[PDB]
Design a protein around this ligand. Structure first.
Ligand SMILES: COc1cc(Nc2nccc(Nc3ccc4c(C)n[nH]c4c3)n2)cc(OC)c1OC
Length: 281
């Protein structure tokens, strides 16, 4: 994948126009940090951005990984409902840095949990059914986009959905091709370790359950063991979450169809959720 091209003219950002701020996360692969970037959208403005940068030193593997991730992001292109690439610092004499949009409210599951006593179905800063269906609609749109670029997301879950201003949600993009988180996995993946876009439709149903439980853990008080997998195969499903509509629960069950080809597609979900948005609003 580091074999796809890197057009520096289009993507390269000067390191002296990045001012690094607080770390958002770290791991045995990289470090993600908040930064202020001047002129990253060509305009004479500062924008807060998110930067993924390598570790203190080398590894070739880790270098190729981040570099491949950059090229994938370029290859996929832009959509409102994914975390978009803004630029990169790849030239010699500094660390490899990949620069993406910053989502200032962080991950969706943590956020929803924080609004459990600030929620009203209809009627301040309160969450309402409109908001939850709007988020669901947005993620579907994001996944419809990834699908059209022939990606699967290995971990479609509320923790991997970030929230920006103006209620915009973005899939934090785990992005592989036609591919070969147990509570989020389709049964054909659990048993065959294989991921397709229809496997993501299953995970999206679990994500919907997360949204309409306001950030609860899936399969409450259930052991993820040999039984759980037997139960899922036989057709056992989660019960409705506390804040769901009937139609949203029906959609969850649709997404959890045993046969992958009987699950709706993301396009179908975008349509259906758009009508629920209009029926609510
Ligand atoms: C969820 O963590 C936050 C993300 C953000 N916002 C954000 N925008 C774009 C990319 C990005 N990457 C990113 C960072 C950190 C992590 C960890 C850890 N796992 N995966 C991660 C991905 N993050 C803002 C935050 O503060 C507002 C966060 O912490 C509350």
């Amino acid at each position: 994948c580091e074999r796809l091209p890197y057009d520096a003219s289009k993507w390269e950002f000067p390191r002296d126009r990045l001012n690094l701020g607080k770390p958002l996360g770290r791991g045995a692969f990289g470090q993600v940090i908040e930064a202020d970037a001047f002129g990253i959208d060509k305009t004479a403005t500062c924008r807060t951005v998110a930067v993924k940068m390598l570790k203190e030193g080398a590894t070739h593997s880790e270098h190729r990984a981040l570099m491949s991730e950059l090229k994938i992001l370029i290859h996929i292109g832009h959509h409102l409902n994914v975390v978009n690439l803004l630029g990169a610092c790849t030239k010699p004499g500094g660390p490899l840095m990949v620069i993406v949009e910053f989502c200032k409210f962080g991950n969706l599951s943590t956020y929803l949990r924080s609004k459990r006593n600030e929620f009203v179905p209809y009627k301040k800063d309160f969450l309402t059914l409109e908001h939850l269906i709007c988020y669901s609609f947005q993620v579907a749109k994001g996944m419809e986009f990834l699908a059209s670029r022939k990606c699967i997301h290995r971990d479609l879950a509320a923790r991997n959905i970030l929230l920006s201003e103006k209620n915009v949600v973005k899939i934090c993009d785990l992005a592989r091709d036609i591919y070969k988180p147990l509570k989020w996995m389709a049964p054909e993946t659990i048993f065959d370790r294989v991921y397709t876009i229809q496997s993501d439709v299953w995970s999206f149903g679990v994500l919907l359950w997360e949204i309409f439980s306001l950030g609860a853990s899936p399969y409450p008080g259930v052991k993820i063991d040999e039984e759980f997998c037997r139960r899922l195969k036989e057709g056992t499903r989660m019960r409705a979450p506390d804040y769901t509509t009937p139609e949203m629960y029906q959609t969850m069950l649709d997404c959890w169809h045993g046969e992958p080809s009987q699950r709706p597609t993301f396009s179908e979900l975008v349509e259906h959720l758009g009508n629920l948005l209009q029926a609510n609003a």
